[PDB]
Design a protein around this ligand. Structure first.
Ligand SMILES: *[C@@H]1O[C@H](CO)[C@@H](O[C@@H]2O[C@H](CO)[C@@H](O)[C@H](O)[C@H]2NC(C)=O)[C@H](O)[C@H]1NC(C)=O
Ligand SMILES: *[C@@H]1O[C@H](CO)[C@@H](O[C@@H]2O[C@H](CO)[C@@H](O)[C@H](O)[C@H]2NC(C)=O)[C@H](O)[C@H]1NC(C)=O
Ligand SMILES: *[C@@H]1O[C@H](CO)[C@@H](O[C@@H]2O[C@H](CO)[C@@H](O)[C@H](O)[C@H]2NC(C)=O)[C@H](O)[C@H]1NC(C)=O
Lengths: 277, 43, 277, 277, 43, 43
C-alpha cells in the first residue's frame, strides 16, 4: 500500500506530457491568442488541464459537443496542424478585421487564430462556397463557427443580409446552422456569441461550406497523425522535469507495491487503487 | 488481482448532470467493492 | 436484517417532507390551478411524488429538460417564490384571458399561475422586451413557455403576426424558440400544445426576453434559498404524522440492525440494503 | 466451466430466430429492396444482425433515434405489417417515380418499399393532409422521412415550393421538420440525403401528417402483436438448423455446468459467464 | 461494511430508455454484489 | 450464485462515445468482479 508520491508531473517513459498551463482544450484547438505556446505541439504521452483554465473561450460562446471531442482526444497522441483555407483567398469578404477586445493579444484586439471571422465588403456579402478534399493519409479534425449577433441592426451592419445560414456537408455530416439573435448580458465586454462546431474528415472525403453570413471559416485544421493510449488529466501542478512509469493528478509514483492510496485516476503501469488507510 | 477496476476520467456538461452522477456512483461503486475485496483478502 | 417498517411517511429529524398529493413536480412549479396547496411551501427534508400524479400538465405539452430539473431539485430544500414580471405591467398585450378549460379552477377556465399566456390587443402584438436583473444573494429558477397553435388561422387570431419567435438571453443562455404549428389529437380537449423551459439565473446576472408572439411569460420565479441533501421519492403513501431517522417508499424504519430488506431507495441514517430473505 | 459450443445459431425452444443475413434493422424496417426476404416475417425468439450489414440505408442518410428503436425492438417478438396510406390514394402528387439508382432492385432504380417518395405533379405540390386513426388493439410502429436536396434548383424541380416543411402530430408527438439543403460528397452516387423518423402510435390515437414538399410518406406501418423477452445479437454466423436452450454469438451451448467461457452476451437459460481459463 | 453501495433514484424520459436500462442494471448489479458479499460473510 | 450479473448488448451512435465507454467499463467491471468472486470461492 504505497502512500508516497513525488508531488509533480513527469514524463511517461521519456515522452513529455502536454501541459496546457492556463489554456483549456478549447482555447488550444481554436487558437486563443493567449495560447500561442501551443501553436505547434510535439507528440504527447498525456494531457494536463487545470480545473478552471483562465484562457478558454475569449469571445463568449459555446463549443458544441465539447466533451465528446475531449473524449476523442484521449486516444490521440499527436496532431499536425495544416492550412485548409488560406486567409489570403477571401476575395469578396473582408477577412482582416474580424477581431475583438474580448480576445486581446498584447493588449490589441485579436481573435482565435485557427478560424477566420469573415465580414462584409463593399456593402455586400456574396454567397461563400468552399471545399477541402482531405488528400492526406490521415483523419482531419476540422473546426468552424457561427456568430450570433445581438440584434437586427448588428446583423445587417456586419453581414448585409438580414437572413443567413451556414451549411456544412461531408459524406456523413448534413448541417445547416442559423444565427440566433438574442439580447444577452455582456461576458468579456461582449453580448454577441460565437458557437463552434467540429467534424472528423475521413481520408478522401471532402467538406463543403456554404454561407451568406455569420460564418466563422476555418483556416487551419488538424491531422491526427499518431493514435494511441492517452488521457486528459485534471491537475493544478506545473511540470516537474522528472520521469516516471505511473502518474497521478497529485504527483508521480515510484513504487514496487501491489496497491496504492493517492488518486483513483492514474495513467501508465500502476499499482491498483484502494480507499484503505 | 491484476484485473481489478481501473477508473477513467469522463466529462459531462451542465445539462448532463444525471449521467455525471450515474458515472460517479459507478466509479465509486467499484472502488468501494475492490477496497472491500482487498481489505478482506488480507483478513 | 430488519424486515419491519411502519407503512407510512414521517418527518426526517423533525423536518416535514413536501408531499405533493396528486400534483407532479411540473404542476407544482408551473402552478397548475389544482395545486394551490403548494403556492408557498415551507422548507422540506425530502419530496414525495406519486407514480402517475393526476395534476401535471393541465394544458397538454412538454416540460423541457424535466428530468435534469428534478435532479436539480434533489439538492434543494427550500424555494422562496418571487415576482419578477408583474401581470399588471403588460400595457400592450392582453394578459387576462390567456386561460383554458383544460386548466379548470373551480370549474372555470384558468391557467398555470406562475406564467402568463399573453394574447394580442387591438389587433396588434408589439415586440416584447423585458429584463430581470437577479439582485438577490441567491440563484433563481426562472420558467417560461411557448404556445404551439394548431394552425395558421389560430396563430393569426391569437397573435396577429404569422411568423414569430421567442429569444431568451442570460450570460450563458442563448435561446431562440419558434412555434411549431401541427395537427394533433386532442388531449384534455386541446390540440394546441405548451412547451416549457427553465434556467438558473446566477446572482447579478440578467435574463432578457424578447418576442412577437406565442410567448408564455414568467410572473413568478423561485429563489433557491436553502441548498442541501434532499431527494424525490416515488410513493403512494399519505402523510403519517410520525417522525423518523430513516425513510423508505414502503414506510419508515425504527431499527438498530446493520442491514435491511424493505426498499433499495432510502433516505437518512439507514441500515444497508440487501436482497436476502 | 463449459468451454465448448456448437459454432452455429439454433432455435430457442423450437422458435426460430430472425436472421437478417446482409440486411440491417434499418434496411428491414424501411424496406430496402435488397431485403424482400423479410417483407413479412414470422414470430422470432431473438434477432441476428452482422457487424456491418451491407444493405442498410440504400439512399444515403440517417435513421433518427435509431439505437432507441433497436432497444425497443429487443422486447418485441412479432410485427404484423399493415397498410396505413395506400400508394394508390395520392391524387395530386406523383407517387410512382420517387426512385433512385442508389436503391437498385434487379439493377433497376427502386426505393425503400415501406415509405413513398412523393414528387410534384403538373408543376404543383399542393399541401398534403393525411390522418391515420389506430383502430387496432395493438401499438403501431409508424415510419416516415424527409428528403434533404443538394440545392435550391433541385428543391424547386422536385417540389416546386422553395420553402417547405413536414409537420407530424399525435397526442404526444409535435414535430415540424425542415429540409436541409447542403453540398455533400456522393454516397452511393447520391449527394442528397434522406432522414427517417419513427413513432409508436398507441391504440385509439391518430397521427396527422401535413407537408408542402420533401415528404417521404408512409405506406406500411407495423402492428406490434407479440411483446416479450427478445434481443439483437451481433454475429457473423449463418443459420444452423439445430435447436438449443442457450445461444451465444459464437455458437449454441448444450451443457449442465454452472459456469461458461464463451461470450458474455447470451440469451436463454444459461450458465453464468466468467473470464476464467 | 459502512461504505457499501447506496442506490439513488434517477429519472429518464421515453427516449432515454437505453440509459434508464443501463442505470437499472447497474443499481441492481451492485445490490446483487453486496447481497452476495453479506450472505457469504455470514457463511 | 443464481443471481449474478448478466450482460446485455446495448448500442450507441458516433456521438455517444462517452456513454458507450461508460457502459463498456461497467459490463466489464461486473464481469471482472464475478470472475474474481467465482475463482476465489473455489480457492
Ligand atoms: C477527393 O479527391 C479524390 C482524389 O482526387 C477523389 O477520388 C479519386 O478520383 C476518382 C473519383 O472521381 C477515382 O477514380 C479515384 O480512384 C480516386 N482516387 C483515390 C486515391 O481515391 C474523390 O472523388 C474526392 N472525394 C470527394 C468526396 O469529392
Ligand atoms: C445587474 O445589476 C447589477 C447591480 O446594479 C450590475 O452590476 C453593478 O453595476 C456596475 C456594472 O455596470 C458595477 O460597477 C458594480 O460593481 C455592480 N455591482 C454589483 C453589486 O455587482 C450588473 O451590471 C447587472 N448585470 C447585468 C448582467 O446586466
Ligand atoms: C380515433 O377513432 C376512435 C374510434 O372512432 C375515436 O374514439 C371514439 O369516438 C368517440 C370520440 O369522439 C367516443 O365517444 C368513443 O368512445 C370512442 N371509441 C373508442 C372505442 O375509443 C377517437 O376519437 C379517434 N382518436 C383520435 C385521436 O382522433
Amino acid at each position: 500500500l504505497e502512500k508516497t508520491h513525488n508531488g509533480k508531473l513527469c514524463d511517461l517513459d521519456g515522452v513529455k506530457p502536454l501541459i496546457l498551463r492556463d489554456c483549456s482544450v478549447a482555447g488550444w484547438l481554436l487558437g486563443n491568442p493567449m495560447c500561442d505556446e501551443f501553436i505547434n505541439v510535439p507528440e504527447w504521452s498525456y494531457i494536463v488541464e487545470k480545473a478552471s483554465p483562465a484562457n478558454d473561450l475569449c469571445y463568449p460562446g459555446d463549443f458544441n459537443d465539447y466533451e465528446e471531442l475531449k473524449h476523442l482526444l484521449s486516444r490521440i497522441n499527436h496532431f499536425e496542424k495544416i492550412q485548409i483555407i488560406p486567409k489570403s483567398s477571401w476575395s469578396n469578404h473582408e477577412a482582416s478585421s474580424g477581431v475583438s477586445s474580448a480576445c486581446p493579444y498584447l493588449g490589441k484586439s485579436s481573435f482565435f487564430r485557427n478560424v477566420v471571422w469573415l465580414i462584409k465588403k463593399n456593402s455586400a456579402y456574396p454567397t461563400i462556397k468552399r471545399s477541402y478534399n482531405n488528400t492526406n493519409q490521415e483523419d482531419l479534425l476540422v473546426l468552424w463557427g457561427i456568430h450570433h449577433p445581438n440584434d437586427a441592426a448588428e446583423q445587417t451592419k456586419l453581414y448585409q443580409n438580414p437572413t443567413t445560414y451556414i451549411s456544412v456537408g461531408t459524406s456523413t455530416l448534413n448541417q445547416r446552422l442559423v444565427p440566433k439573435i438574442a439580447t444577452r448580458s455582456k461576458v468579456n465586454g461582449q453580448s454577441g456569441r460565437m458557437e463552434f462546431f467540429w467534424t472528423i474528415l475521413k481520408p478522401n472525403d471532402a467538406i463543403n461550406f456554404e454561407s451568406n453570413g455569420n460564418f466563422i471559416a476555418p483556416e487551419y485544421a488538424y491531422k491526427i497523425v499518431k493514435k494511441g493510449d492517452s488521457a486528459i488529466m485534471k491537475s493544478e501542478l506545473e511540470y516537474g522535469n522528472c520521469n516516471t512509469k505511473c502518474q497521478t493528478p497529485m504527483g508521480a509514483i515510484n513504487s514496487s507495491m501491489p496497491f496504492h492510496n493517492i488518486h483513483p485516476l492514474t495513467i501508465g503501469e500502476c499499482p491498483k487503487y484502494v480507499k484503505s488507510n | 488481482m491484476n484485473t481489478q477496476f481501473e477508473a477513467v476520467g469522463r466529462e459531462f456538461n451542465n445539462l448532463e448532470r444525471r449521467i455525471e452522477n450515474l458515472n460517479k456512483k459507478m466509479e465509486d461503486g467499484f472502488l468501494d467493492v475492490w477496497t472491500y475485496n482487498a481489505e478482506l483478502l488480507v483478513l
